[PDB]
Amino acid sequence: QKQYWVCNSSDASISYTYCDKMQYPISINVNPCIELKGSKGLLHIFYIPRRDLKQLYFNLYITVNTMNLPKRKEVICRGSDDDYSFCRALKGETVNTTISFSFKGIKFSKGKYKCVVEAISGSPEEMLFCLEFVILHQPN
Amino acid sequence: EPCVEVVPNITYQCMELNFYKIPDNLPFSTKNLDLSWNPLRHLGSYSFFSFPELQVLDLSRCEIQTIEDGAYQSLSHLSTLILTGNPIQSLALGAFSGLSSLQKLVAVETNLASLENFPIGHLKTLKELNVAHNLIQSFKLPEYFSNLTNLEHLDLSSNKIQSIYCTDLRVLHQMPLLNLSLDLSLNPMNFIQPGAFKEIRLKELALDTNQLKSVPDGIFDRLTSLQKIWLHTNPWDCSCPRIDYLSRWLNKNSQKEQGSAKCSGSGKPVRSIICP
Ligand SMILES: CCCCCC/C=C\CCCCCCCCCC(=O)N[C@H]1[C@H](OC[C@H]2O[C@H](OP(=O)(O)O)[C@H](NC(=O)CC(=O)CCCCCCCCCCC)[C@@H](OCCCCCCCCCC)[C@@H]2O)O[C@H](COC)[C@@H](OP(=O)(O)O)[C@@H]1OCC[C@@H](CCCCCCC)OC
Ligand SMILES: *[C@@H]1O[C@H](CO)[C@@H](O[C@@H]2O[C@H](CO)[C@@H](O[C@@H]3O[C@H](CO)[C@@H](O)[C@H](O)[C@@H]3O)[C@H](O)[C@H]2NC(C)=O)[C@H](O)[C@H]1NC(C)=O
Ligand SMILES: *[C@@H]1O[C@H](CO)[C@@H](O)[C@H](O)[C@H]1NC(C)=O
Protein backbone atom coordinates (compact mmCIF):
# COMPACT_ATOMS: atom_id res chain seq x y z
CA GLN A 1 0.00 0.00 0.00
CA LYS A 2 3.08 2.21 -0.45
CA GLN A 3 1.70 5.19 -2.35
CA TYR A 4 3.86 6.95 -4.92
CA TRP A 5 3.17 10.58 -5.79
CA VAL A 6 3.39 11.17 -9.55
CA CYS A 7 2.48 14.83 -9.98
CA ASN A 8 0.38 17.35 -8.04
CA SER A 9 -1.36 19.79 -10.44
CA SER A 10 -3.67 22.82 -10.65
CA ASP A 11 -6.68 20.58 -11.36
CA ALA A 12 -5.71 17.42 -9.57
CA SER A 13 -2.96 15.10 -8.40
CA ILE A 14 -1.79 11.73 -9.62
CA SER A 15 -0.41 8.65 -7.83
CA TYR A 16 -0.27 4.88 -8.04
CA THR A 17 0.25 1.64 -6.14
CA TYR A 18 1.19 -1.88 -7.23
CA CYS A 19 -1.65 -4.36 -7.52
CA ASP A 20 0.65 -7.31 -8.19
CA LYS A 21 2.91 -9.50 -6.05
CA MET A 22 6.23 -8.72 -7.71
CA GLN A 23 6.65 -4.95 -7.34
CA TYR A 24 9.16 -3.78 -9.97
CA PRO A 25 10.34 -0.07 -10.12
CA ILE A 26 8.91 2.52 -12.54
CA SER A 27 9.70 6.18 -13.15
CA ILE A 28 6.50 7.85 -14.36
CA ASN A 29 6.77 11.60 -14.97
CA VAL A 30 3.80 13.45 -16.42
CA ASN A 31 4.82 16.89 -17.73
CA PRO A 32 2.94 19.06 -17.53
CA CYS A 33 0.53 17.49 -15.06
CA ILE A 34 -2.93 16.40 -16.29
CA GLU A 35 -5.52 19.19 -16.12
CA LEU A 36 -8.89 17.47 -15.59
CA LYS A 37 -10.61 19.91 -17.89
CA GLY A 38 -8.16 19.20 -20.74
CA SER A 39 -4.45 19.47 -21.60
CA LYS A 40 -1.64 17.83 -23.53
CA GLY A 41 1.79 16.85 -22.28
CA LEU A 42 4.68 14.44 -22.19
CA LEU A 43 4.30 11.12 -20.41
CA HIS A 44 7.92 10.24 -19.60
CA ILE A 45 8.74 6.66 -18.63
CA PHE A 46 11.77 4.78 -17.47
CA TYR A 47 11.29 1.08 -16.85
CA ILE A 48 12.88 -2.28 -17.55
CA PRO A 49 10.48 -5.10 -18.56
CA ARG A 50 10.85 -8.66 -17.37
CA ARG A 51 9.28 -9.68 -20.69
CA ASP A 52 9.73 -8.65 -24.36
CA LEU A 53 7.37 -5.78 -24.99
CA LYS A 54 6.40 -7.43 -28.29
CA GLN A 55 2.62 -7.85 -28.05
CA LEU A 56 2.32 -5.17 -25.33
CA TYR A 57 -1.22 -4.19 -24.31
CA PHE A 58 -3.15 -2.68 -21.38
CA ASN A 59 -6.35 -3.94 -19.84
CA LEU A 60 -7.93 -0.80 -18.42
CA TYR A 61 -10.17 -0.77 -15.33
CA ILE A 62 -11.50 2.76 -15.02
CA THR A 63 -13.70 3.80 -12.07
CA VAL A 64 -15.26 7.24 -11.73
CA ASN A 65 -16.66 8.21 -8.33
CA THR A 66 -20.15 6.59 -8.81
CA MET A 67 -19.50 3.82 -11.42
CA ASN A 68 -16.82 1.76 -13.10
CA LEU A 69 -16.37 0.99 -16.84
CA PRO A 70 -16.10 -2.63 -18.10
CA LYS A 71 -12.74 -4.16 -18.87
CA ARG A 72 -11.31 -2.34 -21.91
CA LYS A 73 -8.35 -3.68 -23.82
CA GLU A 74 -6.05 -1.08 -25.46
CA VAL A 75 -3.35 -2.43 -27.75
CA ILE A 76 0.05 -0.79 -28.06
CA CYS A 77 2.75 -2.34 -30.24
CA ARG A 78 0.85 -4.29 -32.92
CA GLY A 79 3.17 -6.24 -35.20
CA SER A 80 3.36 -2.88 -37.06
CA ASP A 81 6.18 -0.63 -38.26
CA ASP A 82 4.16 2.26 -36.85
CA ASP A 83 4.51 1.14 -33.23
CA TYR A 84 6.39 3.24 -30.68
CA SER A 85 10.12 2.70 -30.86
CA PHE A 86 10.15 0.79 -27.54
CA CYS A 87 8.18 -2.18 -28.84
CA ARG A 88 11.61 -3.52 -29.80
CA ALA A 89 12.60 -3.67 -26.15
CA LEU A 90 13.66 -7.22 -25.54
CA LYS A 91 13.77 -8.65 -21.96
CA GLY A 92 16.69 -7.15 -20.00
CA GLU A 93 16.61 -3.97 -22.08
CA THR A 94 16.37 -0.39 -20.83
CA VAL A 95 13.20 1.45 -21.85
CA ASN A 96 13.93 5.18 -21.51
CA THR A 97 11.18 6.77 -23.60
CA THR A 98 9.07 9.91 -23.69
CA ILE A 99 5.68 10.01 -25.36
CA SER A 100 3.33 12.78 -26.28
CA PHE A 101 -0.21 12.61 -25.01
CA SER A 102 -3.37 14.69 -25.20
CA PHE A 103 -6.07 14.40 -22.56
CA LYS A 104 -9.40 15.83 -23.67
CA GLY A 105 -11.16 17.02 -20.52
CA ILE A 106 -13.93 15.60 -18.35
CA LYS A 107 -16.80 18.06 -17.88
CA PHE A 108 -17.73 18.68 -14.22
CA SER A 109 -16.71 15.93 -11.77
CA LYS A 110 -14.48 15.86 -8.66
CA GLY A 111 -15.00 12.33 -7.31
CA LYS A 112 -11.84 10.25 -7.11
CA TYR A 113 -10.77 8.56 -10.35
CA LYS A 114 -9.35 5.09 -10.02
CA CYS A 115 -7.77 3.40 -13.03
CA VAL A 116 -6.02 0.04 -12.97
CA VAL A 117 -3.64 -0.64 -15.86
CA GLU A 118 -2.64 -4.27 -16.21
CA ALA A 119 0.34 -4.52 -18.62
CA ILE A 120 0.72 -7.68 -20.77
CA SER A 121 3.11 -8.77 -23.55
CA GLY A 122 5.86 -11.12 -24.79
CA SER A 123 5.34 -14.32 -26.80
CA PRO A 124 3.07 -16.18 -24.50
CA GLU A 125 1.44 -12.98 -23.23
CA GLU A 126 1.99 -12.55 -19.47
CA MET A 127 1.43 -9.79 -16.95
CA LEU A 128 4.27 -7.26 -17.02
CA PHE A 129 2.78 -5.49 -14.04
CA CYS A 130 -0.33 -3.83 -12.69
CA LEU A 131 -0.71 -0.27 -11.43
CA GLU A 132 -3.56 1.37 -9.55
CA PHE A 133 -3.77 4.97 -10.59
CA VAL A 134 -5.75 7.22 -8.29
CA ILE A 135 -6.45 10.76 -9.31
CA LEU A 136 -8.05 13.10 -6.74
CA HIS A 137 -9.74 16.44 -7.54
CA GLN A 138 -10.10 20.02 -6.19
CA PRO A 139 -10.26 22.81 -8.86
CA ASN A 140 -9.00 25.37 -6.30
CA GLU B 1 -3.20 -16.94 -88.84
CA PRO B 2 -3.60 -13.14 -88.68
CA CYS B 3 -3.44 -14.11 -84.96
CA VAL B 4 -0.18 -14.15 -82.99
CA GLU B 5 1.47 -17.24 -81.54
CA VAL B 6 3.22 -17.26 -78.16
CA VAL B 7 3.18 -21.01 -77.64
CA PRO B 8 2.83 -23.42 -80.62
CA ASN B 9 -0.43 -25.41 -80.74
CA ILE B 10 -1.05 -23.98 -77.22
CA THR B 11 -1.44 -20.20 -76.72
CA TYR B 12 -2.78 -17.75 -79.30
CA GLN B 13 -3.45 -14.04 -78.91
CA CYS B 14 -5.89 -12.95 -81.60
CA MET B 15 -6.14 -9.59 -79.79
CA GLU B 16 -7.31 -6.37 -81.52
CA LEU B 17 -7.68 -8.16 -84.89
CA ASN B 18 -11.10 -6.78 -85.88
CA PHE B 19 -12.73 -10.24 -85.94
CA TYR B 20 -16.51 -10.31 -86.23
CA LYS B 21 -16.73 -14.02 -85.78
CA ILE B 22 -14.88 -16.66 -83.76
CA PRO B 23 -11.76 -17.68 -85.75
CA ASP B 24 -11.04 -21.41 -86.23
CA ASN B 25 -7.88 -21.46 -88.31
CA LEU B 26 -6.36 -22.34 -84.93
CA PRO B 27 -5.42 -25.89 -83.70
CA PHE B 28 -8.01 -28.05 -81.94
CA SER B 29 -5.77 -28.57 -78.88
CA THR B 30 -5.35 -24.82 -78.24
CA LYS B 31 -5.43 -24.27 -74.47
CA ASN B 32 -5.22 -20.47 -73.97
CA LEU B 33 -7.16 -18.13 -76.29
CA ASP B 34 -7.31 -14.34 -76.02
CA LEU B 35 -10.03 -12.77 -78.19
CA SER B 36 -10.23 -9.40 -76.41
CA TRP B 37 -11.29 -6.29 -78.38
CA ASN B 38 -12.99 -8.01 -81.30
CA PRO B 39 -16.49 -6.76 -82.35
CA LEU B 40 -17.98 -10.26 -81.68
CA ARG B 41 -21.24 -8.67 -80.52
CA HIS B 42 -23.17 -11.94 -80.16
CA LEU B 43 -22.16 -15.38 -78.94
CA GLY B 44 -24.54 -17.99 -80.27
CA SER B 45 -24.99 -21.64 -79.43
CA TYR B 46 -21.75 -23.56 -79.65
CA SER B 47 -19.72 -20.36 -80.27
CA PHE B 48 -16.54 -22.38 -79.48
CA PHE B 49 -17.14 -25.98 -80.59
CA SER B 50 -13.67 -26.03 -82.20
CA PHE B 51 -11.69 -25.69 -78.92
CA PRO B 52 -12.85 -28.65 -76.80
CA GLU B 53 -9.54 -28.23 -74.99
CA LEU B 54 -9.49 -24.54 -73.96
CA GLN B 55 -8.43 -23.74 -70.38
CA VAL B 56 -8.28 -19.99 -70.29
CA LEU B 57 -10.45 -17.74 -72.44
CA ASP B 58 -10.54 -13.95 -72.69
CA LEU B 59 -13.45 -12.09 -74.34
CA SER B 60 -12.83 -8.78 -72.70
CA ARG B 61 -14.39 -5.68 -74.22
CA CYS B 62 -15.90 -7.55 -77.18
CA GLU B 63 -19.09 -5.48 -77.30
CA ILE B 64 -20.98 -8.74 -76.66
CA GLN B 65 -24.65 -8.10 -75.82
CA THR B 66 -26.08 -11.57 -75.93
CA ILE B 67 -25.10 -15.09 -74.92
CA GLU B 68 -27.50 -17.99 -75.33
CA ASP B 69 -27.69 -21.55 -74.07
CA GLY B 70 -24.70 -23.80 -74.62
CA ALA B 71 -22.65 -20.78 -75.70
CA TYR B 72 -19.66 -22.60 -74.19
CA GLN B 73 -21.26 -26.03 -74.45
CA SER B 74 -18.15 -28.13 -74.99
CA LEU B 75 -15.61 -26.31 -72.83
CA SER B 76 -15.50 -29.01 -70.14
CA HIS B 77 -11.93 -28.04 -69.23
CA LEU B 78 -12.50 -24.30 -69.06
CA SER B 79 -11.25 -22.90 -65.73
CA THR B 80 -11.01 -19.18 -66.46
CA LEU B 81 -13.46 -17.05 -68.49
CA ILE B 82 -12.92 -13.31 -68.61
CA LEU B 83 -16.00 -11.48 -69.87
CA THR B 84 -14.94 -7.94 -68.89
CA GLY B 85 -16.59 -4.69 -70.05
CA ASN B 86 -19.22 -6.21 -72.35
CA PRO B 87 -22.56 -4.32 -72.53
CA ILE B 88 -24.55 -7.54 -71.93
CA GLN B 89 -28.33 -6.98 -71.54
CA SER B 90 -29.93 -10.33 -72.26
CA LEU B 91 -28.36 -13.40 -70.72
CA ALA B 92 -29.44 -16.96 -71.50
CA LEU B 93 -30.73 -18.88 -68.55
CA GLY B 94 -28.50 -21.62 -69.93
CA ALA B 95 -25.63 -19.42 -71.03
CA PHE B 96 -22.83 -20.97 -69.03
CA SER B 97 -23.99 -24.57 -69.39
CA GLY B 98 -21.10 -26.84 -70.30
CA LEU B 99 -18.67 -24.97 -68.02
CA SER B 100 -18.35 -28.00 -65.71
CA SER B 101 -14.69 -27.23 -64.91
CA LEU B 102 -14.88 -23.45 -64.65
CA GLN B 103 -13.16 -21.97 -61.58
CA LYS B 104 -12.55 -18.27 -62.10
CA LEU B 105 -15.11 -16.04 -63.79
CA VAL B 106 -14.51 -12.33 -64.27
CA ALA B 107 -17.60 -10.39 -65.30
CA VAL B 108 -16.31 -7.02 -64.42
CA GLU B 109 -18.37 -4.11 -65.61
CA THR B 110 -20.77 -6.24 -67.68
CA ASN B 111 -23.75 -4.04 -66.94
CA LEU B 112 -25.03 -6.14 -64.01
CA ALA B 113 -27.69 -4.84 -61.61
CA SER B 114 -28.47 -7.94 -59.55
CA LEU B 115 -27.05 -11.42 -59.23
CA GLU B 116 -30.60 -12.75 -59.14
CA ASN B 117 -30.69 -13.50 -62.83
CA PHE B 118 -27.03 -14.43 -63.12
CA PRO B 119 -27.28 -18.11 -64.36
CA ILE B 120 -24.19 -19.44 -62.60
CA GLY B 121 -26.39 -21.68 -60.50
CA HIS B 122 -24.91 -24.92 -61.82
CA LEU B 123 -21.35 -23.65 -61.60
CA LYS B 124 -20.38 -25.89 -58.66
CA THR B 125 -16.62 -25.93 -59.18
CA LEU B 126 -16.45 -22.11 -59.42
CA LYS B 127 -13.85 -20.77 -56.98
CA GLU B 128 -13.89 -17.07 -57.59
CA LEU B 129 -16.47 -14.87 -59.16
CA ASN B 130 -15.51 -11.23 -59.67
CA VAL B 131 -18.42 -9.00 -60.60
CA ALA B 132 -16.83 -5.72 -59.69
CA HIS B 133 -17.59 -2.22 -61.03
CA ASN B 134 -21.22 -2.98 -61.98
CA LEU B 135 -24.67 -1.56 -61.39
CA ILE B 136 -25.77 -3.63 -58.42
CA GLN B 137 -27.57 -1.59 -55.78
CA SER B 138 -29.05 -4.29 -53.59
CA PHE B 139 -26.62 -7.09 -52.94
CA LYS B 140 -28.63 -10.04 -51.68
CA LEU B 141 -27.06 -13.34 -52.64
CA PRO B 142 -29.87 -15.48 -54.12
CA GLU B 143 -30.64 -19.05 -53.25
CA TYR B 144 -28.57 -20.55 -56.07
CA PHE B 145 -25.54 -19.57 -54.02
CA SER B 146 -26.03 -22.83 -52.12
CA ASN B 147 -24.60 -24.83 -54.99
CA LEU B 148 -21.55 -22.51 -54.85
CA THR B 149 -20.05 -25.03 -52.41
CA ASN B 150 -16.49 -23.98 -53.28
CA LEU B 151 -16.78 -20.26 -53.78
CA GLU B 152 -13.88 -18.84 -51.78
CA HIS B 153 -13.70 -15.27 -53.00
CA LEU B 154 -16.53 -12.99 -54.14
CA ASP B 155 -15.69 -9.45 -55.27
CA LEU B 156 -18.52 -6.89 -55.33
CA SER B 157 -16.54 -3.73 -55.03
CA SER B 158 -17.37 -0.46 -56.75
CA ASN B 159 -21.07 -1.12 -57.38
CA LYS B 160 -24.11 0.85 -56.37
CA ILE B 161 -24.57 -0.89 -52.99
CA GLN B 162 -25.60 1.54 -50.25
CA SER B 163 -26.73 -0.91 -47.59
CA ILE B 164 -26.29 -4.38 -46.10
CA TYR B 165 -29.48 -5.90 -44.65
CA CYS B 166 -29.99 -9.17 -42.85
CA THR B 167 -31.53 -11.33 -45.56
CA ASP B 168 -28.66 -10.16 -47.83
CA LEU B 169 -26.31 -12.98 -46.71
CA ARG B 170 -28.90 -15.46 -45.45
CA VAL B 171 -28.25 -18.43 -47.69
CA LEU B 172 -24.74 -18.63 -46.26
CA HIS B 173 -26.15 -20.05 -42.98
CA GLN B 174 -26.58 -23.35 -44.80
CA MET B 175 -22.91 -23.26 -45.79
CA PRO B 176 -20.77 -24.83 -42.98
CA LEU B 177 -17.43 -25.29 -44.78
CA LEU B 178 -17.67 -21.92 -46.60
CA ASN B 179 -14.24 -20.26 -46.34
CA LEU B 180 -15.50 -17.28 -48.27
CA SER B 181 -13.63 -13.98 -48.56
CA LEU B 182 -15.95 -11.09 -49.43
CA ASP B 183 -14.90 -7.73 -50.87
CA LEU B 184 -17.32 -4.79 -50.58
CA SER B 185 -14.98 -1.81 -51.06
CA LEU B 186 -15.46 1.39 -53.06
CA ASN B 187 -19.23 1.18 -52.60
CA PRO B 188 -21.61 4.00 -51.61
CA MET B 189 -22.27 2.10 -48.40
CA ASN B 190 -23.38 4.12 -45.36
CA PHE B 191 -25.66 1.66 -43.63
CA ILE B 192 -25.27 -1.80 -42.20
CA GLN B 193 -28.40 -3.13 -40.53
CA PRO B 194 -27.89 -4.93 -37.17
CA GLY B 195 -27.69 -8.73 -37.24
CA ALA B 196 -26.28 -8.55 -40.73
CA PHE B 197 -23.35 -10.93 -40.16
CA LYS B 198 -24.77 -13.00 -37.29
CA GLU B 199 -24.10 -16.71 -37.57
CA ILE B 200 -22.02 -16.22 -40.75
CA ARG B 201 -18.54 -17.58 -41.53
CA LEU B 202 -16.38 -14.98 -43.39
CA LYS B 203 -12.64 -15.61 -43.72
CA GLU B 204 -11.92 -12.07 -44.97
CA LEU B 205 -14.23 -9.05 -45.09
CA ALA B 206 -13.53 -5.71 -46.77
CA LEU B 207 -15.68 -2.65 -46.13
CA ASP B 208 -13.13 0.03 -46.95
CA THR B 209 -13.49 3.23 -48.91
CA ASN B 210 -17.27 3.23 -48.50
CA GLN B 211 -19.26 5.78 -46.53
CA LEU B 212 -19.97 4.22 -43.18
CA LYS B 213 -20.12 6.70 -40.30
CA SER B 214 -20.83 4.01 -37.70
CA VAL B 215 -21.96 0.45 -37.32
CA PRO B 216 -24.39 -1.56 -35.15
CA ASP B 217 -23.12 -2.55 -31.71
CA GLY B 218 -22.13 -6.24 -31.98
CA ILE B 219 -22.45 -6.39 -35.77
CA PHE B 220 -19.28 -8.53 -36.00
CA ASP B 221 -19.29 -10.18 -32.53
CA ARG B 222 -20.57 -13.52 -33.79
CA LEU B 223 -18.57 -13.82 -37.01
CA THR B 224 -16.71 -17.16 -37.04
CA SER B 225 -13.23 -17.68 -38.68
CA LEU B 226 -12.71 -13.98 -39.54
CA GLN B 227 -8.98 -13.51 -40.16
CA LYS B 228 -8.69 -10.17 -41.97
CA ILE B 229 -10.82 -7.04 -42.07
CA TRP B 230 -10.58 -3.65 -43.79
CA LEU B 231 -12.42 -0.60 -42.56
CA HIS B 232 -10.06 2.23 -43.51
CA THR B 233 -10.66 5.47 -45.28
CA ASN B 234 -14.28 5.72 -44.12
CA PRO B 235 -16.07 8.80 -42.65
CA TRP B 236 -16.16 7.29 -39.16
CA ASP B 237 -17.85 9.32 -36.44
CA CYS B 238 -15.75 9.25 -33.27
CA SER B 239 -18.32 10.53 -30.75
CA CYS B 240 -18.96 8.78 -27.41
CA PRO B 241 -20.63 6.54 -26.71
CA ARG B 242 -21.52 5.88 -30.35
CA ILE B 243 -18.06 4.86 -31.56
CA ASP B 244 -17.42 2.82 -28.41
CA TYR B 245 -18.49 -0.59 -29.73
CA LEU B 246 -16.04 -0.51 -32.65
CA SER B 247 -13.08 1.19 -30.90
CA ARG B 248 -13.18 -1.77 -28.56
CA TRP B 249 -13.80 -4.53 -31.08
CA LEU B 250 -10.80 -3.35 -33.03
CA ASN B 251 -8.59 -3.34 -29.96
CA LYS B 252 -9.77 -6.89 -29.32
CA ASN B 253 -9.10 -7.88 -32.93
CA SER B 254 -6.02 -5.73 -33.66
CA GLN B 255 -4.19 -8.52 -35.52
CA LYS B 256 -7.33 -8.89 -37.74
CA GLU B 257 -7.53 -5.30 -38.97
CA GLN B 258 -5.48 -4.22 -41.97
CA GLY B 259 -4.77 -0.50 -42.25
CA SER B 260 -6.37 1.79 -39.65
CA ALA B 261 -9.93 3.13 -39.72
CA LYS B 262 -9.51 6.79 -38.76
CA CYS B 263 -11.68 9.59 -37.28
CA SER B 264 -13.57 11.99 -39.55
CA GLY B 265 -12.17 15.46 -38.82
CA SER B 266 -9.89 13.99 -36.15
CA GLY B 267 -7.72 11.72 -38.28
CA LYS B 268 -7.06 9.86 -35.05
CA PRO B 269 -7.19 6.05 -35.22
CA VAL B 270 -10.51 4.67 -34.06
CA ARG B 271 -8.68 2.13 -31.96
CA SER B 272 -7.34 4.99 -29.82
CA ILE B 273 -10.69 6.11 -28.44
CA ILE B 274 -11.51 5.00 -24.91
CA CYS B 275 -15.12 6.04 -24.18
CA PRO B 276 -16.74 6.77 -20.75
C1 LIG C 1 -4.93 10.06 -21.85
C2 LIG C 1 -3.41 10.26 -21.79
C3 LIG C 1 -2.94 10.44 -20.35
C4 LIG C 1 -1.42 10.61 -20.26
C5 LIG C 1 -0.98 10.62 -18.79
C6 LIG C 1 -1.56 9.40 -18.08
C7 LIG C 1 -1.00 9.23 -16.67
C8 LIG C 1 -1.30 8.04 -16.00
C9 LIG C 1 -2.17 7.01 -16.71
C10 LIG C 1 -3.39 6.66 -15.86
C11 LIG C 1 -4.49 6.01 -16.70
C12 LIG C 1 -5.05 7.01 -17.72
C13 LIG C 1 -6.27 6.43 -18.45
C14 LIG C 1 -6.92 7.47 -19.37
C15 LIG C 1 -8.26 6.93 -19.90
C16 LIG C 1 -9.05 8.01 -20.63
C17 LIG C 1 -8.47 8.35 -22.00
C18 LIG C 1 -9.18 9.55 -22.63
O1 LIG C 1 -8.67 10.69 -22.51
N1 LIG C 1 -10.30 9.31 -23.28
C19 LIG C 1 -11.05 10.41 -23.92
C20 LIG C 1 -10.95 10.29 -25.45
O2 LIG C 1 -9.56 10.35 -25.82
C21 LIG C 1 -9.34 9.70 -27.08
C22 LIG C 1 -7.86 9.33 -27.15
O3 LIG C 1 -7.04 10.52 -27.17
C23 LIG C 1 -5.64 10.17 -27.18
O4 LIG C 1 -5.34 9.36 -28.32
P1 LIG C 1 -5.62 9.91 -29.80
O5 LIG C 1 -5.18 11.31 -29.97
O6 LIG C 1 -4.86 8.92 -30.81
O7 LIG C 1 -7.19 9.70 -30.05
C24 LIG C 1 -5.28 9.41 -25.90
N2 LIG C 1 -3.83 9.14 -25.87
C25 LIG C 1 -2.95 10.07 -25.51
O8 LIG C 1 -3.25 11.22 -25.19
C26 LIG C 1 -1.48 9.62 -25.53
C27 LIG C 1 -1.36 8.15 -25.14
O9 LIG C 1 -2.33 7.49 -24.79
C28 LIG C 1 0.03 7.51 -25.16
C29 LIG C 1 0.14 6.51 -24.00
C30 LIG C 1 1.50 5.82 -24.07
C31 LIG C 1 1.63 4.75 -22.98
C32 LIG C 1 3.04 4.15 -23.04
C33 LIG C 1 3.30 3.14 -21.92
C34 LIG C 1 4.75 2.67 -22.04
C35 LIG C 1 5.12 1.62 -21.00
C36 LIG C 1 6.58 1.19 -21.22
C37 LIG C 1 7.00 0.17 -20.16
C38 LIG C 1 6.14 -1.10 -20.27
C39 LIG C 1 -6.08 8.11 -25.82
O10 LIG C 1 -5.90 7.50 -24.53
C40 LIG C 1 -4.92 6.44 -24.54
C41 LIG C 1 -4.85 5.99 -23.09
C42 LIG C 1 -3.71 5.00 -22.84
C43 LIG C 1 -3.47 4.92 -21.33
C44 LIG C 1 -2.22 4.11 -21.01
C45 LIG C 1 -1.71 4.43 -19.60
C46 LIG C 1 -0.42 3.68 -19.30
C47 LIG C 1 0.24 4.16 -18.00
C48 LIG C 1 1.58 3.46 -17.79
C49 LIG C 1 2.29 3.97 -16.53
C50 LIG C 1 -7.55 8.53 -25.89
O11 LIG C 1 -8.40 7.37 -25.82
O12 LIG C 1 -11.68 11.37 -26.07
C51 LIG C 1 -13.08 11.24 -25.76
C52 LIG C 1 -13.88 12.20 -26.62
O13 LIG C 1 -13.76 11.82 -28.00
C53 LIG C 1 -14.49 12.74 -28.81
C54 LIG C 1 -13.29 11.48 -24.26
O14 LIG C 1 -14.69 11.37 -23.98
P2 LIG C 1 -15.62 12.68 -23.88
O15 LIG C 1 -15.88 13.31 -25.20
O16 LIG C 1 -16.99 12.24 -23.17
O17 LIG C 1 -14.84 13.66 -22.87
C55 LIG C 1 -12.50 10.44 -23.45
O18 LIG C 1 -12.48 10.77 -22.05
C56 LIG C 1 -13.65 10.38 -21.32
C57 LIG C 1 -13.29 10.22 -19.84
C58 LIG C 1 -12.38 9.00 -19.66
C59 LIG C 1 -11.91 8.78 -18.22
C60 LIG C 1 -10.80 9.74 -17.81
C61 LIG C 1 -10.30 9.40 -16.40
C62 LIG C 1 -9.15 10.30 -15.94
C63 LIG C 1 -7.90 10.12 -16.81
C64 LIG C 1 -6.76 10.99 -16.29
C65 LIG C 1 -5.49 10.78 -17.12
O19 LIG C 1 -13.09 7.82 -20.08
C66 LIG C 1 -14.03 7.42 -19.08
C1 LIG D 1 -12.95 -24.42 -44.85
O1 LIG D 1 -12.57 -24.51 -43.47
C2 LIG D 1 -13.09 -25.70 -42.82
C3 LIG D 1 -12.98 -25.53 -41.30
O2 LIG D 1 -11.73 -24.96 -40.90
C4 LIG D 1 -12.38 -26.92 -43.40
O3 LIG D 1 -12.82 -28.14 -42.74
C5 LIG D 1 -11.78 -28.94 -42.25
O4 LIG D 1 -11.37 -29.83 -43.31
C6 LIG D 1 -10.26 -30.67 -42.95
C7 LIG D 1 -9.88 -31.46 -44.19
O5 LIG D 1 -9.27 -30.61 -45.16
C8 LIG D 1 -10.63 -31.56 -41.75
O6 LIG D 1 -9.51 -32.40 -41.36
C9 LIG D 1 -9.68 -33.78 -41.51
O7 LIG D 1 -9.23 -34.43 -40.29
C10 LIG D 1 -7.77 -34.53 -40.14
C11 LIG D 1 -7.21 -33.12 -39.93
O8 LIG D 1 -6.67 -32.95 -38.62
C12 LIG D 1 -7.13 -35.30 -41.33
O9 LIG D 1 -6.53 -36.50 -40.85
C13 LIG D 1 -8.17 -35.61 -42.43
O10 LIG D 1 -7.51 -36.12 -43.59
C14 LIG D 1 -8.93 -34.31 -42.76
O11 LIG D 1 -8.01 -33.35 -43.24
C15 LIG D 1 -11.07 -30.67 -40.56
O12 LIG D 1 -11.46 -31.50 -39.47
C16 LIG D 1 -12.24 -29.75 -41.02
N1 LIG D 1 -12.78 -28.87 -39.98
C17 LIG D 1 -12.07 -28.42 -38.93
C18 LIG D 1 -11.44 -27.04 -39.04
O13 LIG D 1 -11.96 -29.05 -37.88
C19 LIG D 1 -12.65 -27.01 -44.93
O14 LIG D 1 -11.73 -27.95 -45.50
C20 LIG D 1 -12.50 -25.66 -45.67
N2 LIG D 1 -13.23 -25.74 -46.93
C21 LIG D 1 -13.26 -24.73 -47.80
C22 LIG D 1 -14.47 -24.66 -48.73
O15 LIG D 1 -12.38 -23.85 -47.86
C1 LIG E 1 0.87 -28.91 -83.72
O1 LIG E 1 0.13 -29.94 -83.07
C2 LIG E 1 0.14 -31.17 -83.84
C3 LIG E 1 -0.82 -32.16 -83.17
O2 LIG E 1 -0.15 -33.15 -82.41
C4 LIG E 1 1.60 -31.69 -84.07
O3 LIG E 1 1.61 -32.65 -85.12
C5 LIG E 1 2.59 -30.56 -84.44
O4 LIG E 1 3.94 -31.02 -84.33
C6 LIG E 1 2.39 -29.27 -83.63
N1 LIG E 1 3.25 -28.21 -84.15
C7 LIG E 1 4.58 -28.37 -84.16
C8 LIG E 1 5.23 -28.97 -85.41
O5 LIG E 1 5.28 -28.05 -83.20
Residue numbers in the entry:
A (entry chain D): 19 to 158
B (entry chain A): 27 to 302
Q: Which sentences did the original study use to describe this structure?
A:
Toll-like receptor 4 (TLR4), a superfamily of LRR proteins, is the principal receptor mediating innate immune responses against infections by Gram-negative bacteria. In this process, myeloid differentiation protein 2 (MD2) recognizes various lipopolysaccharides (LPSs) released from the Gram-negative bacteria, forming a complex with LPS at its hydrophobic pocket. In an attempt to prevent the systemic immune response caused by LPS, a TLR4 decoy receptor was constructed by combining LRR modules from the TLR4 ectodomain and VLR. The constructed decoy receptor was shown to attenuate the TLR4-mediated signaling process by trapping MD2, implicating a potential therapeutics for bacteria-induced sepsis and inflammation.
Phe-63 was substituted for tryptophan and leucine for the interaction with Ile-66 in MD2. To get detailed information on interacting interfaces, we attempted to determine the crystal structures of three single variants (M41E, F63W, V134L) in complex with MD2 in the presence of Eritoran. It was shown that Eritoran, derived from the lipid A structure of Rhodobacter sphaeroides LPS, is critical for crystallizing the decoy receptor/MD2 complex. We obtained the crystals of three mutants in complex with MD2 and Eritoran. The F63W mutant /MD2 complex structure was determined at a 3.6 Å resolution and the others at lower resolution. Even at this moderately low resolution, the density maps clearly reveal backbone structure and some side chains. Especially, we could determine the side chain position of the mutated F63W residue and interaction with Arg-68 of MD2. The complex structure of the F63W mutant displayed that Trp-63 was closely positioned to form a cation-π interaction with Arg-68 on MD2, confirming our design strategy. The crystal structures of three single mutants revealed that mutated residues have interactions with the target protein (MD2) as we designed, which confirms that our design strategy works well.
